[PDB]
Swiss-Prot record, chains A, B:
Entry protein name: Phenylethylamine oxidase
Cofactor-binding details, from the entry: Binds 1 copper ion per subunit. Contains 1 topaquinone per subunit.
Function comment: Catalyzes the oxidative deamination of phenylethylamine to phenylacetaldehyde with the concomitant production of hydrogen peroxide and ammonia.
Keywords: Copper, Disulfide bond, Metal-binding, Oxidoreductase, TPQ
Positions bearing 2',4',5'-topaquinone: Y374
EC class of the enzyme, as a word: oxidoreductase
Intrachain S-S bonds: C309-C335
Length: 620, 620
C-alpha cells in the first residue's frame, strides 16, 4: 500500500493502544491533535514506517506532551513535556467549548451582567473564542478562552442576530474558573430575527427553477486506487487529510508522454487567520486562526449529493481521532468529480478552411468546514492544459455586534441596531515545489515599459524583466499589479526543446495583505500575512507559517524565524508560501446568510511542455 | 413589438430599397457599416421609429457617406459626405481583403522579393492588416492596407507557422495600386509545421475521456419572447446585436419583489485594441482595432451544439447586411443557456441544529468571433445573487514572426526559428448606467490603514474611504490593488431600508493598462487604454472610446475630447467606461493552437437590496 494513504480506523486504534500501554494515555489525558507524518525526504527505503504525531493534553493541569508513535513497529518513538508558557497552548478541544457556557451560568458577576440587561440566562449562548496574547499577565501558562454572548429566543433561533455587546468573559478551562467579566456598558440587543428558513422572512419560495441534470452515463474519467490515489487526464496525485490542514495534496504529477513529471510534492493551506478591524475592547482581541487554533479538518461537514456536490461524485471518508483516541469517521467529507469548463481552444482558419474546437475540463477535490458562524469551502482544480488552481469559498453567517447610534468607521450596519465588524480572511498556501524534481528556483517577473527614442522605437515596445531570488532574506516578496508581477518557479537543470528552463508561473489575485498596524499583536503572530510571497529552504519541522502551537502564543516563531537562517534557494529543495485573502466590509446582502465570495490563485505552465499539451484531446 | 428587437432581414431589405430609390446605392457604392440606432433618451413616445445608421463607401474614389434611414417612414433622414482625410476612413470591407494578395501577385518588386527567398507566389498568403497612422504623407485621404506574407505549403496548411519576415507591402485598395514594398532583409522561413489536426503532430488521440452529459429534462428556466427579450430568475434584459460591437445588452433589470429595478441601460464592449510590442519596422505599425476597424460582429462564427456550447442551448441568429445591402444571417451566432455554479450559501449551526445549503446558477450569453489568426469569445454572466460579469476568452493562433538568432527582448520563441511578438489585448466596456434609474454617481473606495495609538487602538483597526467623482475632468481613474480600490455606482435618490444609497460595486482584475510610450501613435489613437476607468455624461453621439471612424484616423477624437467638456456627473445620466486587458508574453504552450486565457470584470450589489436577495431560492 502507499505511504501517503489515508490513516485508517485500525491505525488510530493502534495509536491509542500504544499510548495506553506506554502509560501516556491515562484517564486524565486528552488527545488535542493526531495525524500521520509525511514520509522522510530520503524515502528511497522500503521502510513503510507509518508514524503519527500526537499532542496530549492533561485535564488535571499537568504539563502536556508531544508524542511521535510508530504504528508499524508498535512503539513510542519520542515523548516530550511541553512548556506551554514558552511555546504556546495546544489546540482548543471540542469538550472545552461547552465548559465556558456552563461555568458562566453560575458565576455571579455574569448573572448580574445579564440581569442588568433583563436577559434570561437559559437563553444566553456563549461563543467560545480563542484568547490571543494581550495585556493579561495572569493568562500566561494557563488555558484561557474568551466568551461573547448571543441571545437565542428559541431552540431553532439564529443567535447571531442577537449579539450582547459590551460584555466579555475570560475563562480558565482547566481549573474551571472565571478569571474576569468585563462590562463596558449596556447596548440594546438587536430584536430582528435572522432566520433564513422561516417562511415569513423568505416569503414564498420561487417555483421558476427547472432542474439541471449533470450525469456521466459511462462513469467518471478518473480512477481511484489505494483509497486515495487519483489518475485523471494525464494528472496523477494523492489526496491526503489532516485534522489541522484539511485536504492535503501529495505528489501532483503530469504524464508528459511516457514520462511522469512531478510538479508539486505537497500542497496545502497551512494557516488561515481572520483578524477583526473593530477597535472596541469587546472584540479588538478577536482573530481566528481557524487552522492553528481550532483545526479545520476536525470540523469538516459530511457533504450531501445534489446539494453540496452535484454530478457524478466519488466520496472519501477521512478518519480522525477523538479526544480519547477512538476513531471517528467524517462520512462523505471529501467530494471528488470532474466537470466541463467550456472552450479549451478554437480557431476557424480562412486560408486552410479548417474549423477547430476543443472543450476544457477540470477535476474538483473539495471539502467544507464550519467553525462557529463561519463556513469555508476549500477547492483544488486541475485543468487539461496543466493549470492548477485553488479557490476558497467563504460563506456562513457574518460575525455580529451592535451598530452604535452615532455610527462607526470599523463596522457595517446590516439591519436596525445590528452591526458587522470589518475583517479579513487571510490564507497561507504552502507549496512544497517539485518542478520536474527538487532542484527549483523562484523568479520574479515584472513588465517593463520602454521610452520612445533611438533604441528601436516608435514608442510601441515593451518588455519583461526576471530577477532570481537566491537567498531566503531576499525572498520576502510583495505583489505589484501595476507591473503585472508574477513569480515563476523553474528547474534550471531541466530544459524544454528550445533549451529554456521548464517552469510554472504563479498568478496571484493581488488582494490586500494584513491591514493591522505593523506593531500590533496580530501582526507578530500572523507575520506571514504581511507579505504576498515567502520562499524557504525545505526542512521537516518548518510546517506552519506561525509555528506548531498557535493557541495563545507570541509572534515570530513562524516564517520570520525560518527566513532568518538565510539559506540558499537558487536551485534547491524549496517551499513557496503564498499569502492571499479577502478584505470583508460586510454589506446588507451578506445578512442573514452570506452568499459565497471567493479568493485563490493559480499556477500555469511556463515553457514546461514542448508545445500545447492539449493537442491530443478529442472532439467529444 | 419591442424597439430593442433584433434587426430583421425585411428591415435590411427596406434600407437597401430606400437607399436605392434615393440614389444613394448605385452600382459603385458599398455598405461599410449598417446597424439599428438605439431609441432616444426621451422614449416616452409610442413612436416606433426604427432608424438605421449606414456608412456608404464609393468604389470609384468618390467621397463616402454617412446616412441615417427610417425603415418606419421609408425615408432617408440625413446624408452627409465624409472627408475621410479629416475624420478617418470607413471600416475595412471583406472584399478588400482579397484584393491585396491579388495586386501583389503581379507587382514586380513583390515578385522580386519572393524570388530572392525562393518562394513560389502561388504559395504566398498575404494577411490584410489595418494601416495605422504613421510617417507616410501619401496615405492621408487614401484607403491603404498593409500586407504581411505567410507561406502555405499546401491548401490545408497553417500558414501562421511560416511567416515571411523582413517584408511588408502597402496597398491602395481603391485605386488598386501598390504604393510600397519594403524589404529590410531576408530571414529564414520557419520550416516546422503547426498543424494541430495532423495525427503526426497530435499523436494518438486520448481515449480516456468519458462523456459528460448536461441536460434539462424540463427545459430551461429562462423564457424568450419577442425574439430577444430574456426573463430568468428575477433577471430581465434584451439581447441586441450590432456588426461593430457584437452582442449588446439592453435594459438589464432585476425583479425585487413586484418592483422591476433597472441596473444597466446598455452594456457592450465598445472597442478592443491589440497593440504589438515589437519595435521592428516590419510590425511596429501593428495594432488591431478589432471592433473599430474590422467590425467584430461581422466575423461571428456559427456555434455548434456540443462543441461550442454544451447543455440545453437556445440560439439567436442575428441578421447583418452585406456590402450591397442584402440580408445575411449569422446562423446560431449567439448561444444562451443557464448553468450550475456551485454553492450559493451554506451554514451548519451548532446552536439551532439547522443545516442549510443552496446552489448558485448563472445565465450565459455568448458569441465567438474570428479576425485573421485571432478568435475571441465574449461572455456575459448573470448570477442569482445579483452579480453581473463579463469574460473575454482569447484563443486562436498567435501572430508570428521570425525569432532572430541573437534573441529578442520583445519576442518569444515558440519553435526553432519561430517567434511571437509581445502584445496586449485591451478591451473597453461601455456601461451606460441606470442603478435604480438615471440619477447615478460614481464613488472610488480605497481601504485605509490606521496607526496604532490613542484613538481606539491595539493596532487592529482598519477602515475604508469613499470619494465622489463630481466632474468629468476628475473622472479619469487608475486602479490600485494595494488599497483594494473599487468603484461604486450608486443612486443618491434611492435608498435601502438602512437609509443608505443603493449601489453596485465594480471589481476590476487590475491587469496592466497600455504599455506603449505616452508619446506614441497608438497611445493617441487608443487613449482610453491608458486608464482603468473613465466616467462621462451621456450623449447620443459619444458611442465609442476612439470615435466613429477608427480606420487610419489620428488620436484624441474619442474619450479625451469627451472628458474635456467637464460635465457634471454627480447624480446624472452617466456612462462608465472600463478598460481591462491581457498582457500576452507568448509561451511554448500557446503554439500551435492557443488554449483559452481570460480577463473580465464583475459588478456586485452594494446595499442595493434590503437583505440577501437569494433567501427564496429552493433546495433542489
Ligand atoms: Cu467575512
Ligand atoms: Cu494574445
Amino acid at each position: 500500500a502507499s505511504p501517503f494513504r489515508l490513516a485508517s480506523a485500525g491505525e488510530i486504534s493502534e495509536v491509542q493502544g500504544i499510548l495506553r500501554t506506554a502509560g501516556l494515555l491515562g484517564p486524565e489525558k486528552r488527545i488535542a491533535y493526531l495525524g500521520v507524518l509525511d514520509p522522510a525526504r530520503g524515502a528511497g527505503s522500503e521502510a513503510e514506517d507509518r508514524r503519527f504525531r500526537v499532542f496530549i493534553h492533561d485535564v488535571s493541569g499537568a504539563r502536556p506532551q508531544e508524542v511521535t508513535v510508530s504504528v508499524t513497529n508498535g512503539t513510542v518513538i519520542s515523548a516530550v513535556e511541553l512548556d506551554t508558557a514558552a511555546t504556546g497552548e495546544l489546540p482548543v478541544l471540542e469538550e472545552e467549548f461547552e465548559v465556558v457556557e456552563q461555568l458562566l451560568a453560575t458565576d455571579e458577576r455574569w448573572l448580574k451582567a445579564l440581569a442588568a440587561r433583563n436577559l434570561d440566562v437559559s437563553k444566553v449562548r456563549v461563543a467560545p473564542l480563542s484568547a490571543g496574547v494581550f495585556e493579561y499577565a495572569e493568562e500566561r501558562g494557563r488555558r484561557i478562552l474568551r466568551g461573547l454572548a448571543f441571545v437565542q429566543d428559541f431552540p431553532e433561533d439564529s443567535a447571531w442576530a442577537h449579539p450582547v455587546d459590551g460584555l466579555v468573559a475570560y475563562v480558565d478551562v482547566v481549573s474551571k474558573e472565571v478569571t474576569r467579566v468585563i462590562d463596558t456598558g449596556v447596548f440594546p440587543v438587536p430584536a430582528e430575527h435572522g432566520n433564513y428558513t422561516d417562511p415569513e422572512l423568505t416569503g414564498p419560495l420561487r417555483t421558476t427553477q427547472k432542474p439541471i441534470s449533470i450525469t456521466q452515463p459511462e462513469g467518471p474519467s478518473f480512477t481511484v486506487t489505494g483509497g486515495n490515489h487519483i489518475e485523471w487526464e494525464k494528472w496523477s496525485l494523492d489526496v491526503g487529510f489532516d485534522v489541522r490542514e484539511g485536504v492535503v495534496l501529495h505528489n501532483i504529477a503530469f504524464r508528459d508522454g511516457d514520462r511522469l513529471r512531478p510538479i508539486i510534492n505537497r500542497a496545502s493551506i497551512a494557516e488561515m487567520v481572520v483578524p477583526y478591524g473593530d477597535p472596541s475592547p469587546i472584540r479588538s482581541w478577536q482573530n481566528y486562526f481557524d487552522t492553528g487554533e481550532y483545526l479545520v479538518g476536525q470540523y469538516a461537514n459530511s457533504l450531501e449529493l445534489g446539494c453540496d456536490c452535484l454530478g457524478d461524485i466519488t466520496y472519501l471518508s477521512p478518519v480522525i481521532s477523538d479526544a480519547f483516541g477512538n476513531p471517528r469517521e467524517i462520512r462523505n467529507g471529501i467530494c471528488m468529480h470532474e466537470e466541463d469548463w467550456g472552450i479549451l481552444a478554437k480557431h476557424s482558419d480562412l486560408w486552410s478552411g479548417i474549423n477547430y474546437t476543443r472543450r476544457n475540463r477540470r477535476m474538483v477535490i473539495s471539502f467544507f468546514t464550519t467553525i462557529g458562524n463561519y463556513d469555508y469551502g476549500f477547492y483544488w482544480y486541475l485543468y487539461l492544459d496543466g493549470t492548477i488552481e485553488f479557490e476558497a469559498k467563504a460563506t456562513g453567517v457574518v460575525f455580529t455586534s451592535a451598530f452604535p447610534e452615532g455610527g462607526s468607521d470599523n463596522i457595517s450596519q446590516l439591519a436596525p441596531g445590528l452591526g458587522a465588524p470589518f475583517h479579513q480572511h487571510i490564507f497561507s498556501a504552502r507549496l512544497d515545489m517539485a518542478i520536474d524534481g527538487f532542484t527549483n528556483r523562484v523568479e520574479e517577473e515584472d513588465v517593463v515599459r520602454q521610452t520612445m527614442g533611438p533604441g528601436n522605437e516608435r514608442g510601441n515596445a515593451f518588455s519583461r524583466k526576471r530577477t532570481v531570488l537566491t537567498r531566503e532574506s531576499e525572498a520576502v516578496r510583495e505583489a505589484d499589479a501595476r507591473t503585472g508581477r508574477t513569480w515563476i518557479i523553474s528547474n534550471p537543470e531541466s530544459k524544454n526543446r528550445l533549451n529554456e528552463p521548464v517552469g510554472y508561473k504563479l498568478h496571484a489575485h493581488n488582494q490586500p495583505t494584513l491591514l493591522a498596524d505593523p506593531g500590533s499583536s496580530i501582526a507578530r503572530r500572523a507575520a506571514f500575512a504581511t507579505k504576498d510571497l515567502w520562499v524557504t529552504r525545505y526542512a521537516d519541522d518548518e510546517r506552519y507559517p506561525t509555528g506548531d502551537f498557535v493557541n495563545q502564543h507570541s509572534g515570530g516563531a513562524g516564517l520570520p524565524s525560518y527566513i532568518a537562517q538565510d539559506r540558499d534557494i537558487d536551485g534547491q529543495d524549496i517551499v513557496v508560501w503564498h499569502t492571499f485573502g479577502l478584505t470583508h466590509f460586510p454589506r446588507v446582502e451578506d445578512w442573514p446568510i452570506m452568499p459565497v465570495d471567493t479568493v485563490g490563485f493559480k499556477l500555469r505552465p511556463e515553457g514546461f511542455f514542448d508545445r500545447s499539451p492539449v493537442l491530443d484531446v478529442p472532439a467529444n
